[PDB]
Amino acid sequence: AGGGHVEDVPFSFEGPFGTFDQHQLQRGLQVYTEVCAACHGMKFVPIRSLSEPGGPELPEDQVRAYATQFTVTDEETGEDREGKPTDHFPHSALENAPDLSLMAKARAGFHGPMGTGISQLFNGIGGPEYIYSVLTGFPEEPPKCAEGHEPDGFYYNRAFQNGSVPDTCKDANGVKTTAGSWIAMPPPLMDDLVEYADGHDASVHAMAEDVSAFLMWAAEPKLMARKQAGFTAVMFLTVLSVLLYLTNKRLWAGVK
Amino acid sequence: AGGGHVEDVPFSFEGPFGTFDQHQLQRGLQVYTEVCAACHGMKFVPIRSLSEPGGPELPEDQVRAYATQFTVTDEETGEDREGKPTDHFPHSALENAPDLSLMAKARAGFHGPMGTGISQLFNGIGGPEYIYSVLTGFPEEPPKCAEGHEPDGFYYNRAFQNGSVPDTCKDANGVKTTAGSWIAMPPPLMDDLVEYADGHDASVHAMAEDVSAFLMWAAEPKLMARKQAGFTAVMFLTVLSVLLYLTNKRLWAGVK
Amino acid sequence: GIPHDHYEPRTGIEKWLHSRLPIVALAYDTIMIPTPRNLNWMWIWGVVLAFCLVLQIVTGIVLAMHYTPHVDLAFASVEHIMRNVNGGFMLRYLHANGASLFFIAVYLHIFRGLYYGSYKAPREVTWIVGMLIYLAMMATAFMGYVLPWGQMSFWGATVITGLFGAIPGIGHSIQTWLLGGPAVDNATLNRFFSLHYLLPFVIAALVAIHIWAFHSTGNNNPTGVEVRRTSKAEAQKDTVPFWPYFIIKDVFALAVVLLVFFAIVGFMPNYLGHPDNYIEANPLRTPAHIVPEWYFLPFYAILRAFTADVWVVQIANFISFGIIDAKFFGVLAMFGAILVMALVPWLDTSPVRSGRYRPMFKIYFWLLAADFVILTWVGAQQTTFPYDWISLIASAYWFAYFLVILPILGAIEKPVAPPATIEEDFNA
Amino acid sequence: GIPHDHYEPRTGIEKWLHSRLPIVALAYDTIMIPTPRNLNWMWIWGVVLAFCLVLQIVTGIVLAMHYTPHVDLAFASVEHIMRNVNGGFMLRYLHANGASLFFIAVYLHIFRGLYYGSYKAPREVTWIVGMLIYLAMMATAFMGYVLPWGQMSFWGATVITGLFGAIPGIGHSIQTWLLGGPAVDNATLNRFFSLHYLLPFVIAALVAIHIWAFHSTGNNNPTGVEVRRTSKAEAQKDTVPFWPYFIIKDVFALAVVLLVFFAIVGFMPNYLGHPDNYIEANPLRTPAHIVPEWYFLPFYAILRAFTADVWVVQIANFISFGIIDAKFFGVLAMFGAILVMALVPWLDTSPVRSGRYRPMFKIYFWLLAADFVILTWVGAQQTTFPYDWISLIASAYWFAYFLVILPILGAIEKPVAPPATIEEDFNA
Amino acid sequence: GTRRDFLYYATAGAGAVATGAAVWPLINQMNPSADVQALASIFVDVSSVEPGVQLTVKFLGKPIFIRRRTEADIELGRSVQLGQLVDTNARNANIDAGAEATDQNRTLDEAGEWLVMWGVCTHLGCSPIGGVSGDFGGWFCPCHGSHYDSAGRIRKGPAPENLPIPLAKFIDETTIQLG
Amino acid sequence: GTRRDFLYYATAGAGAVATGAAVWPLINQMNPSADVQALASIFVDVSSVEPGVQLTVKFLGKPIFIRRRTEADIELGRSVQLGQLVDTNARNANIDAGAEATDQNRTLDEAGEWLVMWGVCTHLGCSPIGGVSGDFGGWFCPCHGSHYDSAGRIRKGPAPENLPIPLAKFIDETTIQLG
Ligand code: HEM
Ligand code: HEM
Ligand code: HEM
Ligand code: HEM
Ligand code: HEM
Ligand SMILES: C/C=C(C)/C=C/C=C/[C@H](OC)[C@@H](C)[C@@H](OC)[C@@H](C)CCc1oc2c(O)c(OC)cc(OC)c2c(=O)c1C
């Protein structure tokens, strides 16, 4: 396969001072639930984290209520029961739909240049963007080169790079011509497919942007914690460094 | 609770030169299957061990066939299927029936004297015997002292020592009068409840003796291997000792 | 600090090596040390211990390759090793009985020391380090027993984590911390695995220093009389080079030991252990015959002798305004029983090193031994009469010996005449 | 072997301790060694390494307390640590990026040595031991990466176990053995855990000796000129006591390093790693972008440069009657590339220690460095042209340097004048 | 003077600070993980419980005894006088922290039929053997020989307290809500 | 003389013997456990396989490719002089061990529709990419860049052999028995 293009969305959490946006994450959870969950899952995400600080931070009651929609084979009982916040979301419904638990960390969108990874060094790995792009990347009309060869069950996507491509779209050496490839995931978005309470716009563009950010949190819940830990560590050290520096200079100054 | 009496059966496998009796073990397996298995299980015993050397040593075909009786639930599938020799016998059928996998080992029959464990030192732990005894230990008539107080559902047993006992059978200090106690396991044997192929006698006495020996193997399949390893180790050392002894004696003799 | 002769390179490889890293020299000085000629069989235990340490570590690492530290698997994990891994059954049994051998050894090693004043200056450091090892060993051995996750395993853990709950104030905190939760569960098991692995290396490390230390003062002998440090001449009269003289009897003995050891592991592997641990762990049921590992019994005995009905306990309880109740007293009694033993270099006031020359000493010493045995024996009995009493007198005598008898005997005893030299005794 | 003066007990506790166990003395002699005054910033790496070893071990033991070595749990096991254990997320990341830091260091440490003749006599042993460490490290680092049981984890394991399948004859045996079966499965995982644990201690042990050895010959400096060993007087002119002079410099640097280190672990923990390992391991699919760990890339590059279409390969395949085909050649090429580096003390014939005074040397040395970088860079590229070529020339130059250039330069080069003393240079 | 010395002490200071900042988390990691800290509240159907029967249930990883006492049981409980008890406190979370170990303060109902408490010996931890066992018609902890009466009160042995009663209450006719 | 020396050498001898007797089992324990050694034989329903489709199945822990080749595929396979192949051996367990890499010797059927083989690159191990990829219309192993043709034969890269074909056979109309 190979690598491709990804729209560079300016998410709130990027940058050393970046932090999630509570509401966005919330909107996202709605998109995930109302749309994605249909086929995907999040088996490593404990529902009760919906409550934890630094993320959507929903009220325990709501969470407890939300968890109720799922049906889970109970550990001992073996019979079924409503979901408790102590349960993880369920496995993907659709057999070949991947688990979105770690997606945003599991994908790179910024590659190179020259295979030097200097592009990641300044833009990050770009998983959320990639996800974004994939959602955005479903065009209405297939690229001409494969105007009558669209494999059945698949859909061209501008960002997906590991899909199959009609021979009619490979160059003299088998390389593809198309920017993207054929994915097995039918376009899921559709302007205003979800009703945000506060009325926020449900343009496919937005939804994607959000659900991504959500999925970014879903995979890196302790992000903010991590970064806060950061500043701290740097501070101690930046200081400790300066001090130790002088301490050193002074001590050595007494020999040369 | 406490400790009690256990018939001292002279099993073939006891003693440093002891070894299982292939046929007995076989008979046993039949008793286990035809009678015990009804409620008990052997969750740590891989059926295919029925084949392995040093035990019942049955022909792979028979085993494969035997394994068929069991209705296992497939690892991936989730549906059911016949049993393959690569499956372990099933869990106990009866909720409160213990797993017999390690039973011959999870019990001591010889205790003391004076709580000095010197009785075990010469007779072994006595697990098989205990098991034996328990099977043998169902008497026809309850001990007098509890002539009209037999708890409903339990049965007096001369060897079982952790069962409940009618108040009417406790001395001035709560200690029990009866040799045994009330077990939740209804007498399982009954003369000739199993028709041994070769016609061997199916007296409750025999069956018990056998199924025990089987259960002993079931729990300590690598017994013989262990013992053979034994002689060996002893030999090397017994010799190596003698040699090293002389070697020593000679070296030191040159000083004092 | 004795007069011996150092290492000198012979082969070219040797000279080359020595000028860069005298590692061969070290090994030499370690294996060539002059050692008293009179040493008897009670000095082999050190090596028997050594062997145990290695045995345990290798068989350990191996087992670790098949074991699964996690409640749902753990026990199965071990039966698997028994029934499937090549020679698994023999490895399991070896590791387990390995522990017993390991202790049987230390007790002999320890008592040997107590009797011969091997803890008496200048050998203090040795003794302390040794104690550290002793602690570590037990700590280890405990976690190990937990792994199989069987009945004795669970409850035993439940109880030992409990001892910490006994400390006043912090105690609950400390306990929750060890358990990683409200009860003994996976989290506990998991961390014990990590630690059961770790500790042995720490032991190994101490054992090094242990050796380093007794190497710095020279070994002690049955007479308590030092080696003559004035001339290589007379020193040789008192000693013989470690190699090959001892190196051999060590191996010799080592063999005899292993002979018996294997005999056990071969013919009666389950003798020294508890039948209840072949029962999968059950969080809702404590086996009526729960008993600790024989090598723990004595300290167990002591702990349970002290019930809320013991006079001293009561006194104690009252005077401490309740802070020190039975529970905590029992705990203190136990760790204390050990702690005193560590302070023995300071409670023994007699300036006569070897106990072979202390007529009165000899009496209380053997009582101590008899006691230790009795103590063990009783931990295996019930809390009913006459045991409760026996345990009490036993525990009593224990502290009696370290806190009173030894201190007194120091001034009171009329010591016999120790030979003038090791040589003298040897020739005898 | 430089003149100085040893510790001498002052406090009573000290005098008491010293007469029994001079452990304080040792620590002194270790921390007070006279060290060349001229040492520059390329000498800090040794400590940076030390730190890494400890960091890795502690964070390791900790992680070990939450990890479950078993296919069905293992991966979940780690996400658990990420999402649940207190500060788990920061511990995982620290352990991982710890590895990178750990290597970044050794390469600098290594190259520093190559450039300054730190491997040239009498420092041979040091070098060899160091190599052992290097091997161990990698050995370790590999198993570690396996644990999380993700895509890169599985396949990577599959491949590395494969290298052994390349050995002629025994090879398949050896491989089945490592795998504990027909394929990379639980059994493999399980044994890797036990070994990932174990190795670090072995490393630690070697590191000891490593230090012991460079302590026995004195450290080397940028001039390659030894310290004057004739009088405490002039020696002091060439050196300064390790403590506190360097001990501080070390700590100072150590800080700066950690500053950057934490910056990474805090802000871009996933930079140095492969996104595909956040994908659960799949035995039926090899990710199209499978790439090894950057700190392995160069040796990886070399191995895949040699395809069945390489002339030398063919010549070789011919001459060996097939026995040495491409597969095995690639393997040999790799381990070989390392092995030569170990023999460097013997391939470098020049008697001039510091490379600062070898005009021709400098050139090939820096090419070597440039190469190592290039080599790494290419392992990250595809097998297509021009890469295939680049990798080839690169690998080619590598052996060129050790097997040819160095040997030659020894006789051919016209070396510059090294200062008469370290003092001289220092003052400059 | 104290120009350099100040620095030296300001330095060593920061050092220590950091050092501890490291140590803490290495320690804290051992504390209960966020999954363990999911203190639920279970529900127990107790309809199938005749009198004279103990129901052992798991909760928070430890056992919980639920006995429907006999008259015989309830009798003895009420016979005993507070001052004969080793522990005076009811150790009951449902009621005041000052309550007294009266059999009435140990049950949930006024009839004193429903004894619910942690089957966790207060000595070191075991789950005491029930079914009217020990010198006092209660439970006997085989770990170090501690006796409890028919109300779950310690009467003999090292145990220093009566079995605690956890937040509990009947939510309806045949259901108790532990927690 | 050699009276004592004999002993010394008879001793050291026994020593060594034992030593090894120890080492072996410490080593052997790593070999396949009795549970792994359960080499089954699976069955694959191949009815839902149109031509141009690869079926990847697990077996003995390694993947197994089952491709129903297109004409395009079958053509190129037959269009190659055996002398142009890198490996000459068919590496087919179903037929003789001396067979030749003729596309005909790589398939199960005579039409060449059914290509069944271990999706295990012979280089180091990976499972080569399918969907007609590579430089020879076959599979491409991304681990070290090895190319295989539509018959599963190695044509480019470090790989030294063609993908092996395991014991396999149609047991009926829509079912293959691997093993
Ligand atoms: C807006 C909600 C959704 C999101 C955010 C989402 C996201 C994704 C992502 C990121 C991938 C993987 C891309 C990659 O492999 O690099 C994917 C794959 C897939 N999605 Fe979803 N998806 C959504 C809804 C759906 C729905 C509703 C279905 C089921 C109708 C679905 C079916 C699939 C399938 C089958 C694949 C894998 C097919 C392939 O590999 O080509 N997705 N989805
Ligand atoms: C002082 C050294 C050691 C001692 C005293 C010791 C003791 C024990 C004991 C008593 C058991 C329980 C035996 C049973 O199952 O009944 C055990 C189990 C175990 N030990 Fe150790 N151990 C030591 C070192 C090690 C080391 C170094 C490792 C890891 C490299 C290890 C790994 C295990 C494992 C996995 C088990 C569980 C399986 C088993 O119980 O046999 N042990 N250990
Ligand atoms: C890892 C377990 C241990 C090992 C491998 C070990 C090994 C040794 C060895 C080889 C010796 C020298 C020969 C001898 O007299 O036994 C020794 C001596 C000694 N050991 Fe241990 N030991 C261990 C544990 C202990 C313990 C638990 C104590 C008691 C605290 C202890 C106390 C001593 C004493 C006092 C000496 C006499 C040293 C002298 O003569 O200067 N050791 N030990
Ligand atoms: C465990 C990783 C290692 C640690 C902790 C370590 C540590 C050290 C330390 C502290 C020094 C002295 C100060 C310095 O120059 O930095 C040193 C020196 C040295 N190390 Fe390492 N090292 C490691 C790995 C290696 C490796 C892999 C090699 C390469 C074979 C190596 C070769 C050397 C050499 C040749 C010296 C110079 C000693 C002298 O000047 O005589 N080390 N190392
Ligand atoms: C030379 C020191 C060590 C190195 C270089 C090392 C390296 C590694 C690496 C690269 C990983 C994979 C990290 C990742 O997920 O990306 C790892 C994982 C792990 N290491 Fe270590 N390790 C070292 C020492 C230790 C020690 C002493 C232990 C204690 C047994 C340990 C336990 C673990 C565990 C349990 C994991 C799995 C969890 C995880 O990190 O993902 N490591 N190690
Ligand atoms: C991570 C946790 C750590 C580091 C804990 C460390 C504890 C270290 C101690 O040693 C240093 C401790 C093992 C040592 O006390 C000196 C032993 C003699 C404890 C003795 C012991 O064993 C029991 C046991 O095994 C049981 O199961 C069969 C059951 C038990 O009651 C029923 C006991 C028991 O009641 C006692 C007192």
Ligand SMILES: C/C=C(C)/C=C/C=C/[C@H](OC)[C@@H](C)[C@@H](OC)[C@@H](C)CCc1oc2c(O)c(OC)cc(OC)c2c(=O)c1C
């Ligand atoms: C019990 C002891 C064991 C099992 C020891 C094993 C020791 C192995 C070696 O250490 C000596 C090894 C780590 C070292 O060779 C020197 C490395 C440079 C190996 C280089 C290496 O890595 C890969 C890797 O990581 C992968 O995953 C993403 C995937 C890989 O295919 C693409 C590779 C790979 O193709 C190679 C050559």
Ligand SMILES: CCCCCCCCO[C@@H]1[C@@H](O)[C@H](O)[C@@H](CO)O[C@H]1O
């Ligand atoms: C010397 C090293 C300095 C490093 C400064 C790093 C700034 C990193 O800034 C990164 C972003 O680039 C990245 O997209 C997000 C993703 O969550 O995380 C931030 O920490």
Ligand code: FES
């Ligand atoms: S834990 Fe109950 S008596 Fe000790």
Ligand code: FES
């Ligand atoms: S493993 Fe397939 S190319 Fe190397």
Ligand SMILES: [Sr+2]
């Ligand atoms: Sr962006």
Ligand SMILES: [Sr+2]
């Ligand atoms: Sr008998």
